[PDB]
Design an enzyme around this catalytic site. Structure first.
Site, PDB file in Angstrom:
ATOM      1  N   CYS A 105      31.192  56.149  -1.800  1.00 42.21           N
ATOM      2  CA  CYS A 105      32.352  55.377  -1.295  1.00 42.21           C
ATOM      3  C   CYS A 105      33.706  56.068  -1.525  1.00 42.21           C
ATOM      4  O   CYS A 105      33.996  57.040  -0.842  1.00 42.21           O
ATOM      5  CB  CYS A 105      32.337  53.945  -1.835  1.00 42.21           C
ATOM      6  SG  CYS A 105      33.661  52.867  -1.220  1.00 42.21           S
ATOM      7  N   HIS A 125      33.538  56.701   2.084  1.00 39.54           N
ATOM      8  CA  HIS A 125      33.954  55.577   2.901  1.00 39.54           C
ATOM      9  C   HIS A 125      34.939  56.091   3.946  1.00 39.54           C
ATOM     10  O   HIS A 125      35.764  56.947   3.636  1.00 39.54           O
ATOM     11  CB  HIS A 125      34.619  54.483   2.062  1.00 39.54           C
ATOM     12  CG  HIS A 125      34.767  53.202   2.818  1.00 39.54           C
ATOM     13  ND1 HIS A 125      35.795  52.969   3.699  1.00 39.54           N
ATOM     14  CD2 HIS A 125      33.947  52.125   2.889  1.00 39.54           C
ATOM     15  CE1 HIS A 125      35.628  51.777   4.260  1.00 39.54           C
ATOM     16  NE2 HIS A 125      34.510  51.254   3.789  1.00 39.54           N
TER      17      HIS A 125
END
Lengths: 187, 187
Positions: A105, A125
């Site tokens: 992420c 992400h």
């Protein structure tokens, strides 16, 4: 001998990206140490779930080496990891011994902060891409999980199972990963 | 006024099935109370993640009513929920006021224990089907998430995101659920 994993837990970590890999690795028979960046006390995650670590990072880092070092995401968690001299030393040591480093992420932005694995293909992400790509030190991938040698990255809460199973496959093999996957009821 | 959720956390709960719904509901702006079945102290989950609840169930149950009551799974967690007189009263009250009850994995077996929602279509983890179906009081479904009126059930760790987003859709609507879903990077 069982494989070992160090999961570094900082204030503001994304709790789903922390718990899913810990749980799935333990299902695979990996000895996982959840280590608190700030010490032994419970940690307040991004969505206010409070998790009690198994040890302080100060203590856990003296009990290596580990087969994988895992960095959860969460914007503020990853910022805390990125500012940590202890994290820098752990990651440099892991890189030097050719051990696996796994980050999800916003987590991979801590690799950039500590100059780890330059020249690798990585994902993050979508909202963390610009931070990760500052200086052009990595090549960006949109794969849900990316692995370039010993650098394993992934994108978000919804890729956490895939990320965790990739760690299991890397450490314990495809068959173990398949056996752990089946009872999870994934799609 | 924000919607409210009560998540009942017992020793042996599956930590992924607890954290994913708490996190996703908080992303949807739901006020979530994580309530410890045994009291205020941190709870040791099935894979040894330790979570500190926001309140004891004893206290939280006096601060209702709630728009949803959520029961995580985990075989031992669900057994603890099933043996609890406090849980029985909360679920009966929620059923009587026509409020949503949501249970995942082994969690729905606590509905059977407390005689909640008989005659509904339900799903569970495949390994919990025989327990749930003892006496034929429900009709079994293999859908990843099942909703029959105010009884919402799901199957396992890998259906936790779908389960949580179904709760969000039921309480705050499809548009909010879609907005919360997008940043998660689900497949």
């Amino acid at each position: 001998a069982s494989k070992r994993a160090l999961v570094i837990l900082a204030k503001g970590a994304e709790e789903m990206e922390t718990v899913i890999p810990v749980d799935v690795m333990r299902r695979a028979g990996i000895k996982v140490t959840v280590a608190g960046l700030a010490g032994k006390d419970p940690v307040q995650c991004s969505r206010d779930v409070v998790i009690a670590p198994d040890a302080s990072l100060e203590d856990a880092k003296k009990e290596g080496p580990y087969d994988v070092v895992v960095l959860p995401g969460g914007n503020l968690g990853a910022q805390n990891l990125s500012e940590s001299a202890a994290v820098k030393e752990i990651l440099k040591e892991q890189e030097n011994r050719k051990g696996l480093i796994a980050a999800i992420c916003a987590g991979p932005t801590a690799l950039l902060a500590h100059e780890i694995g330059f020249g690798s293909k990585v994902t993050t992400h979508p909202l963390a891409k610009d931070k990760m790509m500052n200086g052009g030190h990595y090549t960006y991938s949109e794969n849900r999980v990316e692995k370039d040698g010993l650098i394993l990255t992934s994108r978000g809460p919804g890729t956490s199972f895939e990320f965790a199973l990739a760690i299991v496959e890397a450490l314990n093999g495809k068959e173990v990963a398949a056996q752990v996957k089946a009872p999870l009821v994934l799609k």
